[PDB]
Amino acid sequence: TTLPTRCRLEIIEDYYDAIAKNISEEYISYGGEKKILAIQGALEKALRWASGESFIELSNHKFIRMKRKLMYVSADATKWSPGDNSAKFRRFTSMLHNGLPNNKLKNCVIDALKQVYKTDFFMSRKLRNYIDSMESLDPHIKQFLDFFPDGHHGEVKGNWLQGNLNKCSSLFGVAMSLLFKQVWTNLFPELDCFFEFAHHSDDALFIYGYLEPVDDGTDWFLFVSQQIQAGHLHWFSVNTEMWKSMFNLHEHILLLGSIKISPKKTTVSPTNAEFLSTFFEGCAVSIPFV
């Protein structure tokens, strides 16, 4: 990018790094010195919750036994994607509370975000020469030529074009994960489930706590039918293997903020020593010595 773009991205990055380094002990896994601590705490909380047992209350003062099981999602939620909006950070920082009595620097960050919303994408000489050499295929060539009116540059919106917004995107994703956790708590006041997350660099680890029947009886199905007959229409996707529903609600909430969990590069598997060992090794070291 150009110098003013670098200046604006530096302003936003510095402000968000300052506001995010303080919560690095629990949520954001800051590499180098304390990367392992937040993920270790999250895993300890998850294992402690799994060690317990759940007893959902029925209508007639009954207690149905449910098994507390966990499975983990490894996703690069904060990885830069071409389809994104830089304008969504404006309202995010508009009332992200800080210790400053005034609201001067916050307005500066808002203005920087507005300025970086606009951008122009410029052709490269080698690409122009290559396209000038027997452009044959219709769709991509025609759309590419249409995007440049003068044949040299065009207008792009939304994406910061892989600018330095890593900490800002990490904080925003942490905020949306917290929003999803609170929403899941609000929807289910009796299904005391579990959810913890930790973001390291560009990827994040999500812990989902779901419940399954122990005796494989119809008591869970009976409770689901009673709930769905009582006016709680949202229990339809909960009777059988509700961790699908947990992840789907998380994904929809994230998409509400234009954050997409890519089908590629994302793996979900139940508790496994090798899985967690690989995640810890990836968090500890990023560049192989080879």
Binding site: S94, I110, G154, F289
Partner: protein
């Protein structure tokens, strides 16, 4: 002494968590599809077959595979470092062999012409051709220290035809045909078998005890060692010819007792970008990096066979990569050896070391973007088939996005398909247990051996397989990722996403995408929830939760 200008601010909209709870209730009250897919072994096999059919349909068929070995050489005996005296005593004898062969193709005619030109060089010019640049003298036939001239008078009709031709849509091999795959795997297996064939402080103590004893000693007698040294000498000669003065003149060199002969055509110098150096090689048929199909022609001598390759233009970056091919292969094999020792806890056999060394060497010799992309994908597919639910099919189309040109690509695709199917078949049984993780004993859905890629060994942890694929991926030079295809792809991706943004903006209004969308219109539309679009209420609520 600076005052921050007022600029502008944003009024906080009240919003409500209960509204989003209502939306969640409405959204959960229907059928929801899971974006991920289950790994079953049959699923990955079916995906591979369907993608094979789609790739065969999309690209035109091709019956003649292209070339993969950038340099064509052979060795039967041992190799020694090349010197000026060895260079002359090999060039004379090589020209003596060449002048007894009846040409059959125009490239062979050019080779014979160059050999005749060199063997008839004057003693003064021949001596000056092997002189240090501080000592050389300008002559009539030899001008630069290691070059000579060849005008149109000496060229025959065929040679003039090839010079004129050199001076002056995308297909792919049929992957769904077992005959082509079998032929490719047989050829590559023969090449690897030839490569693996043998040729007749306290830290130093530890090194000589373990590494020097079980890696260098084992690989010293391998054919790949001497092949790499020969390729190194060839690359040194080509780099020497790459000078601006020496580029536009002919040249000739020979190595290994006149068995391997190096011919240099006048090529554009490597100072300016987009320049390729043209060279031809003649060698004796034998074990080594030999491909009969890709060879230009074969010449029959007395109880012997002599082969010549086509014109072979290479770039500066790929030339430098070849110059360090042996060292890169050795470092990759040392990394693999260390990882094997860490995983299995013992030392590798001398067959696995030879196999992995041959594989790494062949990867280093043949630098192509297709192989680099394939290994980059394989770096991520192994986690996909190791886990329970993953987006493996999209990774399969990522493998199949590029066309196939050479037999190495077919061989690597076959090996990858076998490995992935085996890994997926392994996942069938998942038993629960109770072992300690961190400070609390918990359950585990642990599946139990992981097959290797370049050898028949079996790993204890798939992190070793990831390290193996990583080492293979980094054997490709950093800079092949700046090819025309990648730049076009990234430009097109950015432009396509910008066009999608413009379409959404014109369909839903400028300010709607600009400032985000309110939630009541989201619930009255149910389509606004997508990428490149955000809900102001969601941002408000996320900010509140973070502020909490």
């Amino acid at each position: 002494p600076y005052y921050i200008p007022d600029y502008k601010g944003m009024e906080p909209i009240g919003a409500n968590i209960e509204d989003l709870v209502d939306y969640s209730k409405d959204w959960l009250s229907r059928a929801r599809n899971f974006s991920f897919f289950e790994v079953k072994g049959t699923a990955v096999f079916e995906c591979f077959n369907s993608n094979e059919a789609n790739h065969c349909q999309r690209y035109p068929m091709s019956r003649k595979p292209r070339n993969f070995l950038l340099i064509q050489c052979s060795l039967i005996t041992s190799y020694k470092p090349a010197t000026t005296l060895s260079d002359q005593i090999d060039s004379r004898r090589a020209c003596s062999y060449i002048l007894n062969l009846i040409p059959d193709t125009p490239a062979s005619y050019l080779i014979h012409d160059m050999a005749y030109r060199y063997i008839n060089l004057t003693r003064e010019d021949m001596i000056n051709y092997y002189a240090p640049r501080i000592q050389f003298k300008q002559t009539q036939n030899v001008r630069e220290p290691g070059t000579f001239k060849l005008t149109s008078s000496m060229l025959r009709a065929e040679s003039k035809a090839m010079l004129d031709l050199l001076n002056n849509q995308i297909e792919s091999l049929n992957i769904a045909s077992h005959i082509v795959q079998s032929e490719s795997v047989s050829l590559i297996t023969k090449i690897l078998s030839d490569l693996e064939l043998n040729i007749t402080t306290v830290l130093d103590k530890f090194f000589q005890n373990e590494t020097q004893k079980y890696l260098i000693d084992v690989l010293k007698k391998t054919t790949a060692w001497h092949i790499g040294h020969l390729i190194r000498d060839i690359t040194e000669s080509l780099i020497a010819h790459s000078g601006l003065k020496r580029s536009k003149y002919w040249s000739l060199h020979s190595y290994n007792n006149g068995n391997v002969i190096l011919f240099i055509l006048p090529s554009k110098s490597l100072e300016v970008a987009g320049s390729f150096i043209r060279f031809i090689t003649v060698f004796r048929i034998g074990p080594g990096l030999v491909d009969k199909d890709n060879l230009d022609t074969i010449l029959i001598d007395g109880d012997s066979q002599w082969g010549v390759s086509k014109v072979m233009s290479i770039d500066l970056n790929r030339l430098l990569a070849l110059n360090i091919a042996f060292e890169k292969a050795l470092i990759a094999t040392a990394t693999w050896f260390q990882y094997y020792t860490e995983d299995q806890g013992q030392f590798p056999l001398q067959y696995a070391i030879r196999s992995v060394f041959a594989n790494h060497f062949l990867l280093a010799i043949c630098q192509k973007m297709k192989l680099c992309a394939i290994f980059d994908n394989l770096r991520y597919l192994i986690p996909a088939v190791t886990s329970l639910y993953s987006g493996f099919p999209s990774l399969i189309e990522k493998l199949f996005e590029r066309p196939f040109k050479s037999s190495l690509e077919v061989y690597i695709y076959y090996n990858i398909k076998s490995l992935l199917v085996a890994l997926a078949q392994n996942n069938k049984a998942r038993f629960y247990s109770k072992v300690k993780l961190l400070g609390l004993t918990v359950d585990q859905s642990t599946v139990g051996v992981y097959p290797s890629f370049m050898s028949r060994i079996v790993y204890k942890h798939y992190r070793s397989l990831i390290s193996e694929v990583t080492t293979c991926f980094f054997l490709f030079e950093k800079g092949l990722h700046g090819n025309m295809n990648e730049e076009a792809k990234i430009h097109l991706e950015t432009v396509e996403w910008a066009l999608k943004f413009r379409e959404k903006e014109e369909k839903y209004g400028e300010s709607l995408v600009e400032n985000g969308y309110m939630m009541w219109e989201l619930r009255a539309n149910a389509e606004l929830a997508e990428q490149q679009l955000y809900c102001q209420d969601a941002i408000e609520l996320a900010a509140i939760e973070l502020n909490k």
